[PDB]
CSV table of N, CA, C and O and ligand atoms in Angstrom, one decimal:
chain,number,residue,atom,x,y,z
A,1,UNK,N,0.8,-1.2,0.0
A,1,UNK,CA,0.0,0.0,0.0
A,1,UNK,C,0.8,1.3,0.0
A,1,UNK,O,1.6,1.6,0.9
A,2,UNK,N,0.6,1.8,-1.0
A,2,UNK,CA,1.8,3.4,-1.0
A,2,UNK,C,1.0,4.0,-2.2
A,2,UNK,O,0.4,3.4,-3.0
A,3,UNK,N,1.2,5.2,-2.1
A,3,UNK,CA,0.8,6.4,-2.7
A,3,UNK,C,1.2,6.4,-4.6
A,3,UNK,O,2.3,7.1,-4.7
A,4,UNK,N,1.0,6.1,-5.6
A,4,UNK,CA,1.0,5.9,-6.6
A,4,UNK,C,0.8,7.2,-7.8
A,4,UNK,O,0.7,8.3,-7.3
A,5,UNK,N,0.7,7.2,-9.0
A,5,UNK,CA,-0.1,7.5,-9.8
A,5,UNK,C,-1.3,8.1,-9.8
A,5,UNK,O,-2.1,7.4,-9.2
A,6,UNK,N,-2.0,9.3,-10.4
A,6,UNK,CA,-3.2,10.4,-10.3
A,6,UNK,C,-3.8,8.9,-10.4
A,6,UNK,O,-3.4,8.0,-11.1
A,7,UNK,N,-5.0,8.7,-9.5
A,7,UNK,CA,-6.1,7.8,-10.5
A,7,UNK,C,-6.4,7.7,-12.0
A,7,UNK,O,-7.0,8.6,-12.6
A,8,UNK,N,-6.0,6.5,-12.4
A,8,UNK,CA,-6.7,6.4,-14.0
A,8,UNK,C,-7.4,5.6,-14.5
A,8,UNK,O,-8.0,5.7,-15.6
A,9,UNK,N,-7.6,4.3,-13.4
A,9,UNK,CA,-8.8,3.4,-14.3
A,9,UNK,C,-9.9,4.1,-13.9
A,9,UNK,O,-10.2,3.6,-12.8
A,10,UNK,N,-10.8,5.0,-14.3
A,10,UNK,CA,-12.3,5.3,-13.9
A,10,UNK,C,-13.5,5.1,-14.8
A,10,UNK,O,-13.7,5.5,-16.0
A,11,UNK,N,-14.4,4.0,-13.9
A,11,UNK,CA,-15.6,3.7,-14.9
A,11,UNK,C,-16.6,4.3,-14.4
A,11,UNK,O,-17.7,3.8,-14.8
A,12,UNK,N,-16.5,5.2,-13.7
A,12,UNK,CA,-17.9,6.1,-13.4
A,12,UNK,C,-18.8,6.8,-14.4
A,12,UNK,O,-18.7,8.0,-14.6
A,13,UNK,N,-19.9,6.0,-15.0
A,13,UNK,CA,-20.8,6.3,-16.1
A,13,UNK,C,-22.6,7.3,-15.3
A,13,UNK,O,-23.2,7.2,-14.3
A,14,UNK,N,-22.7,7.9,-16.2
A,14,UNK,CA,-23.9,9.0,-15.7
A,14,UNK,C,-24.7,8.0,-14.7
A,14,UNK,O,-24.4,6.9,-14.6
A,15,UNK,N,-25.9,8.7,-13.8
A,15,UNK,CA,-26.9,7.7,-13.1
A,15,UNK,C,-28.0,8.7,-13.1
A,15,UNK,O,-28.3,9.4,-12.2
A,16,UNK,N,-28.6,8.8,-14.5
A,16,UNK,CA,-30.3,9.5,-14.5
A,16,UNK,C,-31.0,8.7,-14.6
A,16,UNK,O,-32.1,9.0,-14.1
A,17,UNK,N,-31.0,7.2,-15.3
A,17,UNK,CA,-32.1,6.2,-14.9
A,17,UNK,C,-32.7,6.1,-13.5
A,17,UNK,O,-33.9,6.2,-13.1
A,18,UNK,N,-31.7,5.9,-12.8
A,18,UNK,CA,-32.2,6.4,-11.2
A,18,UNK,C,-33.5,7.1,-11.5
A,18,UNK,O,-33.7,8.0,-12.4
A,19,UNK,N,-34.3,6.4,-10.5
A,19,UNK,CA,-35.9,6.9,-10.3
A,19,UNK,C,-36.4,6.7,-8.9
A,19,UNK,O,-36.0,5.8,-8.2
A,20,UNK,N,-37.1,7.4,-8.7
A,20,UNK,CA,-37.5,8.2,-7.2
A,20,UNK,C,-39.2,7.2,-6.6
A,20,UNK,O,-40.3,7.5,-6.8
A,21,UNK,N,-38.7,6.0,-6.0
A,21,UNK,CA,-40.0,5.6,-6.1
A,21,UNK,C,-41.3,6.3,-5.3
A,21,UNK,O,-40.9,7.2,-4.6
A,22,UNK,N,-42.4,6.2,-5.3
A,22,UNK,CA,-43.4,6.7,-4.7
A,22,UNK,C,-44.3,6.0,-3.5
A,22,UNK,O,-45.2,6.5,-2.8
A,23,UNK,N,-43.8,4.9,-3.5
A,23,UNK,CA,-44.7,3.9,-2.5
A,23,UNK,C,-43.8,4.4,-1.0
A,23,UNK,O,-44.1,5.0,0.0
A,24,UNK,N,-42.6,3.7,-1.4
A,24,UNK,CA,-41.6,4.3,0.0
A,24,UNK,C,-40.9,5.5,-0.1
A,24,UNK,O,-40.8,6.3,0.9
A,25,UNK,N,-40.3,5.9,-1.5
A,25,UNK,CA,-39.9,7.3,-1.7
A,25,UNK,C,-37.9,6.7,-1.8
A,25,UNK,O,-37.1,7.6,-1.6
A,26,UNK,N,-37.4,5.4,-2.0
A,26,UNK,CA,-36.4,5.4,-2.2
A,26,UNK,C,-35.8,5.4,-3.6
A,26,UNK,O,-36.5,5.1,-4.6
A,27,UNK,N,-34.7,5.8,-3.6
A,27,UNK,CA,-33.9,5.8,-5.2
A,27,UNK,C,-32.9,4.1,-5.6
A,27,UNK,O,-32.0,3.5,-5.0
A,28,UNK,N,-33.6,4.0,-6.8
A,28,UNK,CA,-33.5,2.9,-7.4
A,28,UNK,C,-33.0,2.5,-8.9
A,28,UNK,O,-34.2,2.4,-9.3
A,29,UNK,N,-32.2,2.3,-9.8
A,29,UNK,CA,-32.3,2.1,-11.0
A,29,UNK,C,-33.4,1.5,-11.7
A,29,UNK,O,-33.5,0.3,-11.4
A,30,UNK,N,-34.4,2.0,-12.7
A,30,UNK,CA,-35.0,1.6,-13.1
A,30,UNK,C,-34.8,0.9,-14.3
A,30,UNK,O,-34.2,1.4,-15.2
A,31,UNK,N,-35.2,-0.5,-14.5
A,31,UNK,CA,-34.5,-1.5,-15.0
A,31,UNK,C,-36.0,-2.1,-15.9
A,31,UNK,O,-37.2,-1.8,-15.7
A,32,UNK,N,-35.5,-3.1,-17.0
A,32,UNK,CA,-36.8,-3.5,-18.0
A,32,UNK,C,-37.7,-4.6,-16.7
A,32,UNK,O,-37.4,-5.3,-15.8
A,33,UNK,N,-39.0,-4.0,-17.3
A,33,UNK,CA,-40.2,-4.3,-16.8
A,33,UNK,C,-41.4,-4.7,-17.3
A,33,UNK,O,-42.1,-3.8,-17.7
A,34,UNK,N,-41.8,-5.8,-17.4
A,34,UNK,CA,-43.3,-5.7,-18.2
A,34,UNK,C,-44.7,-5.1,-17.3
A,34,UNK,O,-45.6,-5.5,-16.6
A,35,UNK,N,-44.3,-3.8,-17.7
A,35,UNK,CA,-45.2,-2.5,-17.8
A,35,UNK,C,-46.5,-3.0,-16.6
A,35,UNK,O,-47.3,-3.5,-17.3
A,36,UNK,N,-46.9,-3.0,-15.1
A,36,UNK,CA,-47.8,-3.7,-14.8
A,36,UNK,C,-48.6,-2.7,-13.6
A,36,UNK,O,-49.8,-3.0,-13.4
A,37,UNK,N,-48.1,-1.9,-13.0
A,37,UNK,CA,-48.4,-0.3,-12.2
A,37,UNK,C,-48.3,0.6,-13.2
A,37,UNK,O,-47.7,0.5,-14.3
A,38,UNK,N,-49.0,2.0,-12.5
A,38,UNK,CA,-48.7,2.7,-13.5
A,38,UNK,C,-48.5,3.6,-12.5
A,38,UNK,O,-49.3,4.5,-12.1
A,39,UNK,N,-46.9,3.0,-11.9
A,39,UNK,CA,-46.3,4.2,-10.7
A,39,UNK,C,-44.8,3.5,-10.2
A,39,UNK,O,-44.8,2.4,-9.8
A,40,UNK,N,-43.8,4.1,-10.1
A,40,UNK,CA,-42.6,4.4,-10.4
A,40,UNK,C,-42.5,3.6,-8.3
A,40,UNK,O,-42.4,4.2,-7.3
A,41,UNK,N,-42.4,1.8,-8.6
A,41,UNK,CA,-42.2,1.2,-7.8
A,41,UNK,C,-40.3,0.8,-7.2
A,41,UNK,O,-39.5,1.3,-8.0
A,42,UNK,N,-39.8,0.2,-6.4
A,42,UNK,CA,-38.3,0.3,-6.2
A,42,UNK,C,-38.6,-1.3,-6.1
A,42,UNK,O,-39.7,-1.7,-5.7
A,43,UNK,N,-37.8,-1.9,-6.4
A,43,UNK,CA,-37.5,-3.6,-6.0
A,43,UNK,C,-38.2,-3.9,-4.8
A,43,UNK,O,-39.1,-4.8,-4.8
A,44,UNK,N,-37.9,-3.3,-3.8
A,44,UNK,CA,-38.3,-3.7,-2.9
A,44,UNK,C,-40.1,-3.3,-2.6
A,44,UNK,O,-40.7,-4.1,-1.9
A,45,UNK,N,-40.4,-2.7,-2.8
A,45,UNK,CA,-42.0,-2.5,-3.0
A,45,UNK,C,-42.7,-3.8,-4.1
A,45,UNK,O,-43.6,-4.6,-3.9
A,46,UNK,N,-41.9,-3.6,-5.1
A,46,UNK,CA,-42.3,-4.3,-6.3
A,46,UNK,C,-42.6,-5.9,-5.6
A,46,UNK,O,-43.5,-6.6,-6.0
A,47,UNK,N,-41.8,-6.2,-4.8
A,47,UNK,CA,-41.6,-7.5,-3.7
A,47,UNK,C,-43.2,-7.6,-3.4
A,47,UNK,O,-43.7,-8.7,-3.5
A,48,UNK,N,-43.8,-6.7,-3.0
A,48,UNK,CA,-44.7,-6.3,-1.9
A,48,UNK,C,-45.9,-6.1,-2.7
A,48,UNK,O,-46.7,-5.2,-2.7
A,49,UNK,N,-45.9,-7.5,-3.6
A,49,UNK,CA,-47.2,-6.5,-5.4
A,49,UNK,C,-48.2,-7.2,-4.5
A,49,UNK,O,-49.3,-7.1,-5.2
A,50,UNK,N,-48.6,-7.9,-3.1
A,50,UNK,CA,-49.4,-8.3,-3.2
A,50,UNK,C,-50.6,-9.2,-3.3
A,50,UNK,O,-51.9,-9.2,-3.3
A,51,UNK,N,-49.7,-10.0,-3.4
A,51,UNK,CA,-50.5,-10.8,-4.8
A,51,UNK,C,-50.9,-12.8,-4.6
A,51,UNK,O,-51.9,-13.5,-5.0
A,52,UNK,N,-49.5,-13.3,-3.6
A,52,UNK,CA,-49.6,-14.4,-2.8
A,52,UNK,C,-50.6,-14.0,-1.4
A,52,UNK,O,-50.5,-13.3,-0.4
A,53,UNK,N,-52.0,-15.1,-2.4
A,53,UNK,CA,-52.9,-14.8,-0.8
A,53,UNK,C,-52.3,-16.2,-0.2
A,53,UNK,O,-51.7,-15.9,0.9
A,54,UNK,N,-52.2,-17.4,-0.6
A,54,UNK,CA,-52.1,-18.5,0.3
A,54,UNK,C,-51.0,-18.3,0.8
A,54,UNK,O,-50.1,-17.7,0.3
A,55,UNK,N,-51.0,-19.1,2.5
A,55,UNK,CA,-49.7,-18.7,3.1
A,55,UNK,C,-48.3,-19.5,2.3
A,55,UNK,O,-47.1,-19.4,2.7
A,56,UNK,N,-48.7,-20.3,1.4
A,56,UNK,CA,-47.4,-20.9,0.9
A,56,UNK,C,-46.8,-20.1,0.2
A,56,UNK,O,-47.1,-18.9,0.4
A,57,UNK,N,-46.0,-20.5,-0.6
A,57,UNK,CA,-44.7,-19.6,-1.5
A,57,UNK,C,-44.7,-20.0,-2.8
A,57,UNK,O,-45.2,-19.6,-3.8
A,58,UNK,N,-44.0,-20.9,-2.6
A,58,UNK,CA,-43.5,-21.8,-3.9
A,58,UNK,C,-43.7,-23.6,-3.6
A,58,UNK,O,-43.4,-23.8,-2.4
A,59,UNK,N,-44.1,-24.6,-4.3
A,59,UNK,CA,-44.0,-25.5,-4.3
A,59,UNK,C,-43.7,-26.3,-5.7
A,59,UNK,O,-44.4,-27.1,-6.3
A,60,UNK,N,-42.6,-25.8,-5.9
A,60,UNK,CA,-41.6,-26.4,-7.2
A,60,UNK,C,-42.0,-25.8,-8.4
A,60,UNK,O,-42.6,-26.4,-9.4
A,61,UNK,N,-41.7,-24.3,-8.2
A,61,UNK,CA,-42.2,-23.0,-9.5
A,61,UNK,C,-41.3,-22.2,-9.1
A,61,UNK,O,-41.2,-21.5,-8.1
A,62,UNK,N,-40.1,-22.3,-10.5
A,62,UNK,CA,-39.2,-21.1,-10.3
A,62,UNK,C,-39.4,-20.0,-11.2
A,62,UNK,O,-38.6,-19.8,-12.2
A,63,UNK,N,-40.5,-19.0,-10.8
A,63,UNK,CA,-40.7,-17.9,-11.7
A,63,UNK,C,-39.6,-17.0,-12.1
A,63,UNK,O,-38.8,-16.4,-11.4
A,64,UNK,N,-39.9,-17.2,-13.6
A,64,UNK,CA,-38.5,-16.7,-14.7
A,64,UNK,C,-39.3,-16.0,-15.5
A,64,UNK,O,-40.5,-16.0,-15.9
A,65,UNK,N,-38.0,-14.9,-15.7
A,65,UNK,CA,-38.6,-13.6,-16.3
A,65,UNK,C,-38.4,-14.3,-17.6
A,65,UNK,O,-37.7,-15.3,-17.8
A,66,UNK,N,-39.4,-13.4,-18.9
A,66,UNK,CA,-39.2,-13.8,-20.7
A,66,UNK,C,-37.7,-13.7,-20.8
A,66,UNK,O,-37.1,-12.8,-20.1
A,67,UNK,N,-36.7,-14.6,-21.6
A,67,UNK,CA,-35.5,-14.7,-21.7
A,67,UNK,C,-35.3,-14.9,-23.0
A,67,UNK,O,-36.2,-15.6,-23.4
A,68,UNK,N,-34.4,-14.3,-24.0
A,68,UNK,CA,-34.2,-14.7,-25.5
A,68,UNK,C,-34.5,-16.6,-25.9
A,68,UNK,O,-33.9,-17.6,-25.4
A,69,UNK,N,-35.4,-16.7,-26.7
A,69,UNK,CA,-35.5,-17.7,-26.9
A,69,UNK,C,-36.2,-18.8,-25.9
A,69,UNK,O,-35.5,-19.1,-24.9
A,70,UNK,N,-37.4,-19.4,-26.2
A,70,UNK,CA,-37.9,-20.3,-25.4
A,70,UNK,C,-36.9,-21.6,-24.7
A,70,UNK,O,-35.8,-21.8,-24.9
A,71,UNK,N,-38.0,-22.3,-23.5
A,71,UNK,CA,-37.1,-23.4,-23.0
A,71,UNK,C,-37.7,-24.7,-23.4
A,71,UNK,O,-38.6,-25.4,-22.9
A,72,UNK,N,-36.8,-24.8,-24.6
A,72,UNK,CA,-36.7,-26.2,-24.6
A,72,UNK,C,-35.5,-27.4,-24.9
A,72,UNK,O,-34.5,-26.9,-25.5
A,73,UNK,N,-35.4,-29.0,-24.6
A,73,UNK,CA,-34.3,-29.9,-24.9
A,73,UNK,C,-34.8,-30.9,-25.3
A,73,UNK,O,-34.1,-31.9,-25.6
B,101,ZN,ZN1,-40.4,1.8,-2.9
């Protein structure tokens, strides 16, 4: 550890996708979505759609987002 060289690898690229959610009010990158509120949610709200009434979860369903090309072998 010792004092080197001005910094030169820098990959610090803009952050205006950043979006301001409205449910909690945290800052989030807004990322592709199939379009389903029509209000500027953060991951962690998005968690919270509501939507599991039974108390279970999952029982052998691993929900996968649309991916290039169907699954099949
Ligand atoms: Zn939120």
């Amino acid at each position: 550890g010792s004092s080197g060289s001005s910094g030169k690898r820098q990959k610090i690229h803009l952050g205006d996708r950043s979006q301001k959610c409205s449910k909690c009010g945290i800052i989030f990158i807004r990322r592709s979505t199939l379009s389903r509120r029509k209000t500027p949610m953060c991951e962690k709200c998005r968690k919270d759609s509501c939507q599991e009434a039974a108390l279970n979860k999952d029982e052998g369903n691993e929900s996968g987002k649309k991916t290039s090309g169907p699954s099949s072998g």
